[PDB]
Amino acid sequence: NPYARQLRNGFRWLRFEKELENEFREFLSWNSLMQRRAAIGVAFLIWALFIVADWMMVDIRLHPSLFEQLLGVRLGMIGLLLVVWPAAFLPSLRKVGDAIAPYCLLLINLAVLACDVLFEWHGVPRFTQLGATLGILAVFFPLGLAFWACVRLALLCLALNLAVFLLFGGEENLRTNLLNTLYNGLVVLICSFALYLQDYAQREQFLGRRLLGMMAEQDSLTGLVNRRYYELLAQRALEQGAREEKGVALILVDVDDFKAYNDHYGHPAGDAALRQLGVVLRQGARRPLDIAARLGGEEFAVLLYDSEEGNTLAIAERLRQAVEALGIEHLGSSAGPCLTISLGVAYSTSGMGLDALYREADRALYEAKDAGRNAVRV
Amino acid sequence: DNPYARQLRNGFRWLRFEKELENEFREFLSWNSLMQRRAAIGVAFLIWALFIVADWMMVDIRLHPSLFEQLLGVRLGMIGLLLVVWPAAFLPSLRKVGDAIAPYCLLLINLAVLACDVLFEWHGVPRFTQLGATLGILAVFFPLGLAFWACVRLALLCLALNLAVFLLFGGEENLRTNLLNTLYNGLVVLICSFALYLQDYAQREQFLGRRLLGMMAEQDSLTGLVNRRYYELLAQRALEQGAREEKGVALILVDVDDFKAYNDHYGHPAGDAALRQLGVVLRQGARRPLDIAARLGGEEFAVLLYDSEEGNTLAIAERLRQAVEALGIEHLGSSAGPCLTISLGVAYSTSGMGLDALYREADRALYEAKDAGRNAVRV
Ligand SMILES: Nc1nc2c(ncn2[C@@H]2O[C@H](COP(=O)(O)CP(=O)(O)OP(=O)(O)O)[C@@H](O)[C@H]2O)c(=O)[nH]1
Ligand SMILES: Nc1nc2c(ncn2[C@@H]2O[C@H](COP(=O)(O)CP(=O)(O)OP(=O)(O)O)[C@@H](O)[C@H]2O)c(=O)[nH]1
Ligand SMILES: Nc1nc2c(ncn2[C@@H]2O[C@H](COP(=O)(O)CP(=O)(O)OP(=O)(O)O)[C@@H](O)[C@H]2O)c(=O)[nH]1
Ligand SMILES: Nc1nc2c(ncn2[C@@H]2O[C@H](COP(=O)(O)CP(=O)(O)OP(=O)(O)O)[C@@H](O)[C@H]2O)c(=O)[nH]1
Ligand SMILES: [Mg+2]
Ligand SMILES: [Mg+2]
């Protein structure tokens, strides 16, 4: 089981196998549709709050040109925010949003510094140094991106935020911006702790549900289908077979003389071979809508879909030969040097239930097992 | 079913478990969060040390020596507080004490963040690191192992102090800057609350899943009592323990008689229905200490007994046989009575004797009870 082995060996440093990671990314994108809706809404609200704050804070009568330039930049992203808005709600193109989400964030960061880079252009001192911080925290919003995607994005944002102040506004406020950029560095580090626990929990919650579902779908010792799933699926198979008007053939597999194997070879060794029986039974089960299941204990049942009586006899004979050709020693057998297998085949028609076919299948094995080696009766 | 499975099916939006589950979860949270306190103490010591360096970096000691001294006293005070709480957090013996002051420790850190600022306006010097108050809020969201609502209510209280101190002790010269920064900090809390919710929700589902996955796989059964493989581990351990203290172990196998009639006349859902009442009445009849009851597979089950004599084993076998006989279930196809009949086989084990020998004797008596018209118990 690919899911089980990933959980056992651990997934530290937050990385799956190539196929599992691709499945996880689809899982991440599927469950982050609601988060994208909130992220677009909050970004529109935040930038709207920036505009009203700027107008009510800076005087226009003395610096009208500065106000006009700032107002153009802010509305520019707001209009650009309404053009990426149709690309985040339509499910038809949600895939492209996985690659443009970094584009839609770093561009927002670009405008955050653009508003400040104009206060010193017009010779007006700043009134809030917390603008740069809110652009950085937008990176950590849960847009369904991975751990390393968000982390590498904020670090790039941090570098660009530091760069804009070094080449601009020189010999003025340099100490206060460098400290604020340094303070932001701690902001990124603190948020990295929390995001790590989020992504680690998310992956191992995804791994659990896949493993839990598979475990209930199959049995444990072998890879066949457990009892309660087999009953439900066979009823669906019978209903489907009646819908398309074609008979369903049932063949049951039973091991003969298992006390001798148990008491002479040991309890763990006696059925250690059960997996070997499972694989050689499964390799003979490759047809479409052809199932392999264990009914609990020594006896197994496999269901054939759209097969004729000649085919059922042919496939039953070769699997009996195949298990005989395995040649596992079993000294207590009265029908051969090695362990022997009994088969019982029954045919089911449309509108005829599971109970009747099982009744029509059991005594063929009973008449075969007794006074018989590996005989098969229809 | 399981309490863990019950919660998962019910759902846990708003992040609240049952009282017993939440107490287990909180202990689970504290156990796994022990490593996080190592980093939390490290960063808080490092951050406050860096605050001291920054304050001395530019503050004019010549012009304002009193301001520098007062700030230096406050910052070293919490570092002293960090060195007195540090021995109370790394010791596993009082880990409950270590997180008994976690809201207390964070609030004090927030207090010094504002106290090392308001003194700038006390001495008439404009501040230079308005971002300082924000760092006192982000400390609340550090993964200290607290619950979701504990962190959320803590940061909101820290938000209140920022607004209160700047409106009252913040004078009137830099107010318009203060409310803007406090309003921006409100967005900081809101943004971090989104990520916090996903963290706690993802964590809680795992604990329900891990408890459910482990218990269903290793232990228990879908309808029965215990998995066959786990029964084998217990039986080997019980035999090893029994041989160590030199006492016999009694084994009893319970079998259903004439099950073909029940299956083909009453149906499969009736057949598995007969199983689960059979399981519960066998479970209620198994109350001895270190008593193992399991579903081996198919129709037969085995119960393991520790420190019992032949008379007790025969006595308990008879009453459960009468109990299941007293249970009125229509099994009209029976050839041994009006209702379904149950066969039992009891075997005794000695010291240093393998499970195959006792199992062979146990089933041997079972068939010799079967051919005797059922309803028989043999040793
Ligand atoms: N059982 C749990 N283990 C957890 C939980 N959170 C973290 N961990 C542990 O985190 C481990 C991840 O590997 P590391 O120790 O390298 C992770 P790091 O040291 O960077 O941070 P922690 O996750 O705080 O240990 C993993 O072995 C888990 O046992 C949790 O909620 N439950
Ligand atoms: N290790 C395991 N042993 C099993 C399992 N299921 C059944 N058994 C063992 O197999 C036996 C039950 O099957 P039967 O007694 O009907 C075996 P036998 O081949 O003699 O039956 P017929 O061929 O129908 O006469 C019994 O010894 C069980 O302990 C299993 O999943 N694992
Ligand atoms: N299968 C997953 N569901 C998730 C994940 N993250 C969030 N959710 C969903 O979160 C939901 C729990 O919250 P509610 O249903 O009350 C809606 P709320 O807005 O509070 O949460 P979200 O649905 O996460 O926005 C739940 O239905 C999940 O489907 C995830 O990683 N996997
Ligand atoms: N509904 C279920 N039927 C089961 C289950 N396990 C076995 N069986 C049925 O039990 C039958 C196997 O034969 P049994 O060992 O029950 C023999 P029975 O008690 O009918 O006759 P005696 O040998 O005279 O005691 C067969 O019809 C199986 O389908 C199970 O978990 N559920
Ligand atoms: Mg058999
Ligand atoms: Mg029987």
Author numbering:
A (entry chain B): 15 to 392
B (entry chain A): 14 to 392
Relevant lines from the article:
Cyclic dimeric guanosine monophosphate (c-di-GMP) serves as a bacterial second messenger that modulates various processes including biofilm formation, motility, and host-microbe symbiosis. Here, we show that iron regulates c-di-GMP levels in Pseudomonas aeruginosa by modulating the interaction between an iron-sensing protein, IsmP, and a diguanylate cyclase, ImcA. Binding of iron to the CHASE4 domain of IsmP inhibits the IsmP-ImcA interaction, which leads to increased c-di-GMP synthesis by ImcA, thus promoting biofilm formation and reducing bacterial motility. Our prediction results reflected that ImcA contains six membrane-spanning domains and a GGDEF domain while IsmP is a multi-domain protein comprised of several domains including the PASPAC (IsmP273-413), GGDEF (IsmP413-585), EAL (IsmP585-865), and CHASE4 (IsmP59-220) domains.
To further investigate the interaction mode between ImcA and its substrate, the substrate analog GMPCPP-bound ImcA homodimer structure was determined using Cryo-EM at 3.07 Å resolution. ImcA is primarily composed of two parts, such as the N-terminal 6TM domain spanning from L47 to E231 and the C-terminal GGDEF (equivalent to DGC) domain containing residues from R241 to A393, which are connected to each other by a flexible hinge loop. Our PISA analysis depicted that the inter-ImcA monomer interface covered an area of ~2656.4 Å2 with a solvation-free energy gain (ΔiG) of -48.6 kcal/mol, which corresponds to a strongly hydrophobic interface. Nevertheless, it’s worth noting that no polar contact between C-terminal DGC domains was observed. And considering the existence of long flexible hinge loop, ImcA DGC domains presumably may keep undergoing high-speed vibration in a local space as reflected by its higher overall B factor and worse electron density map compared to 6TM domain. The nonhydrolyzable analog “GMPCPP” of substrate GTP adopted a relatively extended conformation when bound to the catalytic pocket. Moreover, the ribofuranose 3’-hydroxy group (3’-OH) also formed a hydrogen bond with the sidechain carbonyl oxygen atom of N276 in chain B. Consequently, GMPCPP was finally attracted and anchored to a narrow stripped positively-charged surface with its purine ring stretching to the hinge loop, meanwhile, crossing the top of the conserved 310’GGEEF314’ motif in DGC domain. Furthermore, Mg2+ was not stabilized by β and γ phosphate groups of GMPCPP, but also D268 and V269 in D-riched motif 268’DVDDF272’ together with E312 from 310’GGEEF314’. Interestingly, there are two extra symmetric ligands found in the vicinity of the cytoplasmic side of 6TM domain, which is not reported earlier. Compared to those located in the DGC catalytic pockets, the GMPCPP adopted a relatively bent conformation, interacting with fewer residues via polar bonds mediated by R26 and N45 located in front of TM1, Q219 and Y214 located on TM6.
